């Protein structure tokens, strides 16, 4: 695709959510880069309204799908950079077993280099001593995978997880997470075949910053479509 | 810096020229907004005393560096919002290579809420038949790195690059920019680390307006200084 | 409209009030100078009659719209200028809720280089103890969003707004205005399509001023119509 | 080590090169996995610049040698995995007798779960119809010995071996490779005993693929250090 | 065969096995090399996972028949051979009197130079201290005879033998296998004749290994089909 | 000996052989069986390499004096059996009168139940059109003596004896041999007292093979020393 | 028959016996030589089982008559060399008069130079104390007469004789002798007519014999057919 092209080097990166969830209203910037050639993106997340009033890793995931390495026999498979630059919106609800839910909306475009993605999410229904509220998971993060499929009734894909987020006491709340995107432009987008992404992330913390933040290192990469060449490497062990 | 808080939103944008070149006197009004959340800015210049005597793209630099994109971990180095509401001055000579120059005096402050540059520029030496007054560049204009140093003597900044103008034949015409910012009230100013901004523009003409005009859409990044987390961001990798 | 040519530069404003508030007979005299090239306001209002009866800031929005900053974009819609020289009147009831009304009728115009406001005011029902005639408002003022409508019946406009009076008690008491201007002359006005004008006031004392005052900084700027260009800067973008 | 676990399933590879051959420059990317349990690398590699102006054979030795199978007996000597995930440099010159030299410089090293090998390639002095650039050089590949010792000096190994490229008219193109691998990380590497590497590559094109570009399997096993039970087997014989 | 050219040198072989006996999961990797012309293997095992849930023993002939010695005169009666290097799918049962049983199957193939062994293994039924559970076999290994016969309904061979497995109060545990080998590719395999290999096996450790393991020396040899030339020696001893 | 114990019965052979006589470059193997118990063998030797260089009958002594039957009463004077499993080294030169010579280096030992004798021989300066190139021996053979003495300071034996080749024109060629064996292993080895071998041997070819192929019968029977009951017999004699 | 030929000189013998008397298992082997000139052998016989259990003279006949010296004028009744190289099986019942018996079968056949007689023996029925398995024989033995007959219908021989055992007590044990000898061969044989074996044996012992083990010498004579020159003597002594 022609926004495929905007991905082949080192991209700037700006994310802005505003949040409420159960009333706790917040904001949260963040700022780093991706570089879609190795899938990877580093970030830092800061909460600009002081506490962060949820876990760090319930949020990862509303915080650039666009960013992923897709194979070379998977390029017709991209939506996301298909989409750019004028970019896609990116839509979930993410059901918290025996818990609360996230809505969120994002809008995910190019302003000049950057790369840009604004988030509003509404979380309801939390316990107020549940895994959110109570602040009882885990500051890590599993590694998982992404189902995508088309959906031509809206010009756009609906992707499927779920995430394993580890408890303190050594159980595994489950995010059920239902995502829709869909075009902001009326350009030519990629329907893709049926695939996923393979994701992994670690959080940490910088040192030097006092305010309440993450920091995120991430690698995804597409796959779930055969290379198609696995009869011409044996027709060449035969030789 | 207090100044920042004044740039959290979008921003309305007033600019007035008064140009002498070679003797040809003229007058340019422009308004837009500038969003220096992402660097970015949309105007409309207008020659409100007919036919502008210079090519529209040799006064873009002439016509906001308050509107730079400064990320988080170089927000101590924004000179430019630092200065305001008050403001700055900013002087330039643009050396023309093979050509005149043009010399500029602006002052950069809010009217209420309104930020307001206010331009005076005078032309010399200019040849009749050279880029600039036989009007022989492209409308068109490149990106460029615009590079900052303290000027603790003025309590202010130094500021110098060099613009490529494409000319119509494909040859470069070079406009070799000197700069100086100094503000205009008594309030403490931040003085930066050496850094740079990061400039694309874009020109166009709007196909309602009859005047001689100019609309540009520009996008402005500061950069140059370490986030300081490349070790971190390696340590998450070896997890 | 030929109107727009007596405010390109700073003109000098004078203003006078004969008021009647319950029977308290007292006369305001102000004077300073107004650029609507910035839609700014600098004014100082003398009581001439002793200690004015009414708090200062219930008076601010009765003591020159014809310096409103019209955006380029906006000429065609400013009636207020329009009307220059001959002028126009502007006729006002202000409700107080809870509480009394004055109903206004000034008449702007130039005499010569002056831009002259001539207005009589009455002010009646209001409680002995209330806001008004309690002294209860604090000396500031907020910044409001002035809506304008055509009424071509009366080849004029008709203006409503709510001004947010802060009371010392931490409440609000509100001003609702209900506003009319026609023109004084036979010449052609502009009849402007459903506008607004954003308003910001600063309010202070002249330390060297024994008589009872109000000094007056104000900045207004009309809005509420596109310059149409959204899609231009669309396509630039994508450029 | 460490490292060693890296590779106990089957690995994503990631190749780049960007080459200059007597000036005609060209890029190389290369998908693929590598299963070091067996020592099986399988890869396709495209010229994403056109046309690859020198013989795909002469690259492939430029084109991971973390995906050997060493023997459990010579676990200990395997200083490439040992410098994982961190990775090694591998620089070399290749001399092609009564012809030019390639230089290069490699970093191989994880991103996330993707094994990079990122290649700088420069080509110098070779003969405008010699068997490179006059591609006379068959599409096929001959089994090799890469011998391997330590260079304490540098923290890393010496590696030396002589490529026999089979030429149309029957004779054969020697390519003469001097390598040096040194960590990038500061973690404990093996310096290993001296041994080999013996290597079967077989080349074969994609019949789906339109660009320029070779299809890669290669098997690579660690040997030359005896397993020391040789005098174990005889006993075991005569019983 | 075309197969048989594989063979006559020395072949490295890699074992890998996959265990399940009662739930106790186990894994093994084992090397070492065969020499088709003598029959000959020469091979050690590793258990991965600690201490080996089931006697050494009861595994050899799970833990290769593609290197036995087949007699010139019957040539045409190896089927393993004939199937590589795309290899075969060995399946058995084996039934220890009075005690569990085993199922296993194996892939046996050419990963380029080397001859990989690829096997799961599940165990049920077993008595908690019977001869396998209990591990009361001794640690050595009895000689016998592998009839084969040919399966043309699944253009492989049938295979079946009786393992006579020592115990350490003087009797003897057999393990009867049956066994099936079907090829992995779709070129032509041999179907034999009905023939035999006769078998031999020693088993010991090795003195510098500290990890649970088993030392194996196998020699292999097809008989049963006569070189049809006795009539001819007898008439050579007239003479 | 113990040695001899692995004799009792009938035993499988295989001969190996690489052979260069004035350059031209062949092979051979040998399969059939030995029983010592009468001193037979049963061997049938293939040229692998297409039609063999030089007469088979020259051949005969290179392609197992361990399958000797050795009298009850010489049972100490047997070196052959008494350096087995391990093996001895068999050299020779043999020296064609008139003609060339070889000179060969066989091991001959057990791998398991099979005893292989693997032999290198080269010849030298043979005549085009002697007998031995000029292939004018009868395919046949004579009966021979074949000396044995000990050869303390080799810890083996010394063997001398003169092969007669009949040739097609009546005449014989004598072919000298000298030969030494030496144990492989370290373990005692018998030293015999000066004895013989009687050999006799039948050569044919089997119809049912095309390759080029001699087959051989051979009796073997160590002879020369007496079992010293001549007295004895006598004395019976007188009764 | 060509058979006498292989008989004109001095040939060594070879015979095996295994044996099963009343369920005790015991193996003989035997060496010596024969000359059929003049009908002799010289032998000696070893228990290789360790004691031989039965006495060694109940075996001497079942222990060659293919070296009976035929008469000049009989030579045409031979029928056991005639059978050679061949040979005959030779199969017996030997009754012992109020015990047991053997039942023998025997193969006599030439091994290359050497004549080997490879014999089974079972014996049955032996009482405990009787005169064989109680040891009651003497060490000597008696001449007989052995009548052969032929056995058309078998293309072979009847033979029949009575042994006389010596017993320490000076009884005799008479040893009922039935024979049958049938050639191996497919080639004609000798038929005889009836005539008889006059046989003479002495018995000793080896006295640097440690093993159990029986030294015997034979004299075997053909006989009972005239000359047909009684009359020629006759005439002879008249003159």
Redesign the interface.
């Known amino acids: 695709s022609k926004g495929e092209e905007l991905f082949t080097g080192v991209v700037?990166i700006?994310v802005?959510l505003d949040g409420d969830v159960n009333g706790h209203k917040f904001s949260v910037?963040g700022?780093g880069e991706g570089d879609a050639?190795?899938?990877?993106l580093?970030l830092?997340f800061?909460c600009t309204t002081g506490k962060l009033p949820v876990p760090w890793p319930t949020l990862v995931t509303t915080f650039l799908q666009c960013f992923a390495?897709y194979?070379?026999?998977m390029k017709q498979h991209d939506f996301f950079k298909s989409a750019m630059?004028?970019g896609y919106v990116q839509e979930r609800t993410i059901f918290f077993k025996d818990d609360g839910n996230y809505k969120t909306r994002a809008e995910v475009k190019?302003?000049?280099?950057?790369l840009?993605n604004r988030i509003e999410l509404k979380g309801i229904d939390f316990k107020e001593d549940g895994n959110i509220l109570g602040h009882k998971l885990e500051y890590n993060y599993n590694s998982h995978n992404v189902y995508i499929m088309a959906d031509k009734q809206k010009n756009g894909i609906k992707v499927n997880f779920k995430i394993r987020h580890n408890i303190e006491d050594g159980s595994v709340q489950l995010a059920d997470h239902y995502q829709q995107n869909t075009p902001i432009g009326d350009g030519p987008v990629l329907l893709p075949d049926n695939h996923y992404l393979?994701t992994?992330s670690?959080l940490?913390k910088?040192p030097?910053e006092k305010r309440d933040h993450m920091?995120l290192?991430e690698?995804v990469?597409a796959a779930g479509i055969t290379?198609?060449?696995d009869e011409?490497?044996?027709?060449?062990?035969?030789?």
């Open positions: 700037p700006l802005e910037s700022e050639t190795y899938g990877k580093t830092k800061i390495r194979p070379d026999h630059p004028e190019f302003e000049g280099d950057t840009v393979s992994q670690a940490s910088d030097n920091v290192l690698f990469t290379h198609g060449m011409l490497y044996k027709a060449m062990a035969k030789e």
